[PDB]
Amino acid sequence: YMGWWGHMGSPPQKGIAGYTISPFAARPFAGVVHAAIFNTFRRTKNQALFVILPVSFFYYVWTQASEKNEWLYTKAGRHELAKAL
Amino acid sequence: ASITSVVKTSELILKSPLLSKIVVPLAKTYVKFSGYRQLGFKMNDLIIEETPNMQLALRRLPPTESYDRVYRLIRATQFSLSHKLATGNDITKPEEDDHYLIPYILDVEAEAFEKDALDNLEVV
Amino acid sequence: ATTFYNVFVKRNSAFVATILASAFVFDMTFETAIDNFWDRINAGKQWKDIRHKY
Amino acid sequence: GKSTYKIPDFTPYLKKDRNTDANRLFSYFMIGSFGMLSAAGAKATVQDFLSNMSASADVLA
Amino acid sequence: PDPAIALHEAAAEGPCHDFKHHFDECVERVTKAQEAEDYDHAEYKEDCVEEFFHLQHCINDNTADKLFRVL
Amino acid sequence: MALRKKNSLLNMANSYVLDSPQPSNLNYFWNFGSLLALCLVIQLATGITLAMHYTSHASLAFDSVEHIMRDVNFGWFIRYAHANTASFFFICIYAHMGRNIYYGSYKTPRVLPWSIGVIIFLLLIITAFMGYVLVFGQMSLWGATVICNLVSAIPWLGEDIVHFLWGGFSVGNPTLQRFFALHYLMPFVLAVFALLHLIALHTAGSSNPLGITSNVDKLSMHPYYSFKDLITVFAFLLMFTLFVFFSPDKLGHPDNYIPANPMVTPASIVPEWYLLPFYAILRAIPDKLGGVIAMVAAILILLILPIVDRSIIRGNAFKPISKLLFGFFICNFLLLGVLGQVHIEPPFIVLGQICTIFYFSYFLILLPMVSTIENIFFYIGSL
Amino acid sequence: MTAAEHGLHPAEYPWPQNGMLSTFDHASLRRGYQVYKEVCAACHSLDRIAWRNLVGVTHTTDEAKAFAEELEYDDEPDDEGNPRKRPGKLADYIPGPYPNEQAARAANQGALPPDLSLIAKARHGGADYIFALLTGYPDEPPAGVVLAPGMNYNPYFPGGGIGMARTLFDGVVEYEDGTPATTSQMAKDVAAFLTWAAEPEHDERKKLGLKAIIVISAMLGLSVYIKKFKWSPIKNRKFIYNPP
Amino acid sequence: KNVIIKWRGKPIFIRHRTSEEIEEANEVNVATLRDPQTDDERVQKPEWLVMIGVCTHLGCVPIGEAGDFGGWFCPCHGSHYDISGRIRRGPAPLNLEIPEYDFADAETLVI
Ligand code: HEC
């Protein structure tokens, strides 16, 4: 499924012109400030829900479970603990 | 899964009025949130191609379609490495998201599945 | 500045020799500098600071 | 979008002084600094690490 | 004399007063309950450890930094 | 023709580290491969060094580790480096497996590197378990006791097999000496399998975060990924430095600084943090043998991802629903980890079972369902 | 578990050695050795510490040799193969108060006082636990706690009933540097000493960490410049497509 | 009388229990026992209480004959075991473990 340089196994390419400039001719950090602020905000915003939803749910679950467990092993929780065992 | 399976199931849904009424709007939003259009891909560009069947279907593409596919993949790869999105004409509009490959893969698979069936025929 | 490039950078043999000689200098000076800094932030705490009592 | 002799716009990234010795020298100063700290770090790493094989404090007692 | 003694007393009367009083009231209840007969043949014997821990935890939060400052 | 291509030996190196054609869009999660290689090298160097100072006999083992800490020049560093890198090895391996699951690296044509990878993961677990025993502190002994007794669950022969592992009737000197020998060996076996999974991968090349072919746009492994790998090497070393130099015992259990005592049983016997999810899975099943099977199945079920993922699309970059499901799966795996170190008490007992059900239902139900649905949505959605 | 069964968790005290750049206070270490020597050593061994380990940490070579030479250690047998004693040397380990575990337990109503060489690493809390435990014997157990005979109530110890009685009282030690020997002072000093005993490399380790952090940070900064420099041809690449 | 045989480092309490001792042990309602077990489960022979003589709390050896249930009392944290060697009072969670022992003869046991 992959070849090697010269015969990589690409469908025939035609009609694309690629251009680039030397590493010595470019500013490596061109537009870094804009990217660091605006680009990162865009990328983070677009992914935020996929992180926040599961983290918040499982943190809530853990919080409820740890708080119940703590309460069951108090004096006040004696009866509820007796039933739970 | 096979593309044949996906296409047949989708046709069952589009037939049923009730089902299409509830599925088609969902699928349109899904595709909007999927975000592949923001890298200038058409849906079909994303189908896994490292299978014998898909290699054969890609070899059957008309040269123009094939050349354009190569460009879209290269362009998307450049957006990906740059962490940029397509803008302007590079964004795939819904009308440009044509199923250019589905007919070819459906034909390749049709023959391969007929071959499997007929390899199991029993003279009655 | 051309001169500096030509002497220390152009030949890789020269560049590697410059890097290693700089590493030698850095290593010796950094050691000394950190020693002094460490002694100032931990002043009166270290054995060297109380040793004189004994 | 058609002529391939019309080089795309690279003005956002081109350095005006790109062919000067100053320009090259600076990038090699970064490469060289990195080589220098790698050399100093490797020397410290190797020296400290191999010293485990010299006589331990209980043996020297 | 031990700096801790003074700091602990001050923190109990001041910022940890609620917990001090909880512990006190607990002690009163338990001692009174031990005074009553057929206490030894009871199922559940209440202690004051919980209240003690709440008080000590509080005192320690208000004292730790102060104590180490005067050593 | 250039020597690096002409000479057979050089050409093998060249094919892996220099001319190797890589996708030009690998993101930083493709850097875990090299970090795992770095961990493996650090573990070999520090491990072989500790072996020069460690004594495997149970009468001397714990004391030899104290001798390393106290008397050997830089012994403290070599010991802490070895112990902490064992933790980082698992952080990187979970990251690497996470990358592989999210981006569909397990799909055809990469089932073979994935499957060999699952075995590497098992060897890493065995290696790290045995290494922990070698300290012969309280957690070393009691961890060995508890974990080796799980083999007693094997019907008919279980008891006999445990005595055979131990070389005796409890964990003791014979066990310690044999774990030393095997712990020394296992990293070399693990290095071999790591090399096999690479050779297997080299037929398809690396996947990439878009999940499309990269055959159209390749970049040499060097210099581009060489220099990009340095960034994460230095980031890794900074994290390594903060643990090894400034908080060397943050990831440890204090009880392992008490010499093993077969009479005194520690407060709570837990495995090292990186085994905790599997421990939680075991506790979830009440049956002893059931528990063991589930625990092994939790690892071996990874082998069926190639089958149960029915998507026509490789990886999750474009699949909002799969991304949500993946997020929940990963967080649940972390919850399992947490529940592995709580006491067997309400309400964590029931919660552990629910998380275990969620863990397996991802592979068996949700991923097959979700991947089938998204196939249909992509097709109908783009009509 | 009940909080009692866990033990009260010790406060976080601001130790001199807390702090990425902070060593032990060696004056405190020396005072803490004197507390170990005059109070704890009656019951607790410090087997992993040799006299030489004190040198250039708490004591000069001469002071430490003096401490070693005051003791008798087992020599190699004489020429008739009879056992012999010799005076201690710097290479000798600080000797324990009891010949074996059985003798230790017999002297402590069955409890075995642990070796203290590693106790700062072997308990959650470290210095803070040792300080909290030594200073945390209340005058009276919380009402309703039933102590087993020969146990003492201490909330920091798991279960609450500890076989070690309170031992630090104002002026049990006379410090040689004129520091007032209050319960708190002695606990702080001995806790610092024991922390040093557990991790004697601590001071050197943190200094080498400082050097590492600095070099590794610089290399990380430079590696980012170099990556960006070498990658710029790929990031900056532009395409023109003319469909054929 | 109660003997102490070391066996795999762990001490083994061997008590030659009297008739009335056996009776005393067979009384306690199993219900009220941290670790619920009857003497019958523990011994294979009522006249030979053989146990692993380490306290199940931390791991001192209980002083026999002492206690409050007159069996074994761990002096370390004050846990009381019975004439069955069952835990009755104190921090210890479990009853004193029983080794695998067999009566080869009626006058010799192997452990
Ligand atoms: C005369 C007896 C005695 C003296 C004096 C003594 N201890 Fe102890 N210590 C014990 C005994 C016995 C235990 C075990 C208690 C138990 O396990 O119930 C112990 C336990 C400890 C523990 C650990 C408790 C645990 O978590 O297991 C520390 C730490 C400790 N001692 C430190 C000291 C320090 C510091 C001093 C004095 C500066 C000191 N001891 C003085 C008898 C003593």
Ligand code: HEM
């Ligand atoms: C010592 C442990 C390991 C080492 C050193 C290692 C190293 C690597 C390296 C260098 C690569 C290529 C670059 C990269 O993608 O990061 C790679 C790819 C891969 N590894 Fe690992 N690996 C290890 C363990 C594992 C494990 C446990 C798995 C799976 C469970 C695994 C599955 C894979 C797969 C599927 C790929 C191809 C991914 C892709 O590029 O799309 N490896 N590994």
Ligand code: HEM
């Ligand atoms: C994948 C590679 C390895 C892993 C994951 C690994 C893991 C571990 C772990 C977790 C420990 C317990 C450390 C502690 O808490 O002190 C350890 C100890 C040890 N390992 Fe390894 N190890 C590896 C490779 C090696 C190798 C190759 C050797 C060569 C002999 C080795 C020798 C030792 C020795 C001698 C100890 C005991 C001394 C000690 O505890 O520090 N290890 N290892």
Ligand SMILES: CCCCCCCCCCCCO[C@@H]1O[C@H](CO)[C@@H](O[C@H]2O[C@H](CO)[C@@H](O)[C@H](O)[C@H]2O)[C@H](O)[C@H]1O
């Ligand atoms: C091909 C490679 C060449 C051979 C490699 C040589 C390996 C061993 C050589 C030196 C090892 C011992 O050499 C010794 O190193 C240690 C640091 O490790 C230095 O020691 C210095 O720093 C350490 C901690 O960093 C302190 O404990 C010490 O008090 C201080 O003097 C000594 O000043 C040096 O004399």
Ligand SMILES: CCCCCCCCCCCCO[C@@H]1O[C@H](CO)[C@@H](O[C@H]2O[C@H](CO)[C@@H](O)[C@H](O)[C@H]2O)[C@H](O)[C@H]1O
């Ligand atoms: C990772 C550390 C570096 C050491 C190298 C790893 C050791 C593993 C190497 C032995 C495995 C065989 O490696 C195999 O060899 C040949 C040539 O070398 C490669 O062959 C590839 O490159 C050569 C030229 O570079 C071409 O002739 C060939 O058409 C192409 O497929 C295979 O793609 C690779 O799978």
Ligand code: FES
């Ligand atoms: S040690 Fe047996 S009572 Fe605590």
